[PDB]
């Protein structure tokens with residue numbers, strides 16, 4: 001299967017998780033493409049992919065709850081081509097904040113509204129990939145079960 005992992009990361013944490021997921025998922029035999037959301041154009045972004053994984057870190061303040069680069073992309077979700085495709089979401093955040101990884105449920109929410117099938121429980125965790133390999137590895141296995 002073909003997987004696109006698009007992430008918004010401001011200190012490299014979610015970027016980290018995204019590299020790890022690519023690693024684990026390629027070891028599962030699949031073609032993976034890793035895309036920084038700062039470099040992504042929403043229009044037809046999902047063409048050709050069997051599954052799309054969305055990474056987005058949590059930022060309660062100034063920023064309209066989402067990571068910068070991901071907010072610009074998320075607001076164009078209906079241009080991506082998500083109808084009929086498999087989708088899952090993951091984030092890095094901090095439990096000490098009132099709303100922990102709030103982008104997770106919204107990504108799942110909008111995707112599903114645009115006709116995508118959510119294939120794994122959304123990953124909410126703190127730090128980078130190495131901070132919590134067990135959380136990353138579960139997310140990956142769940143995705144890999146739907147590929």
Ligand SMILES: Cc1cc2nc3c(=O)[nH]c(=O)nc-3n(C[C@H](O)[C@H](O)[C@H](O)COP(=O)(O)O)c2cc1C
Nearest residue numbers: 009010011012013014057058059060093094100101
């Ligand atoms: C300005 C500021 C606001 C934050 N707001 C939230 C938030 O409300 N919810 C949350 O879960 N984490 C919040 N965090 C934690 C960050 O999202 C956390 O450091 C995360 O790992 C960063 O991910 P990234 O490096 O991939 O962008 C905040 C951190 C900073 C410093």
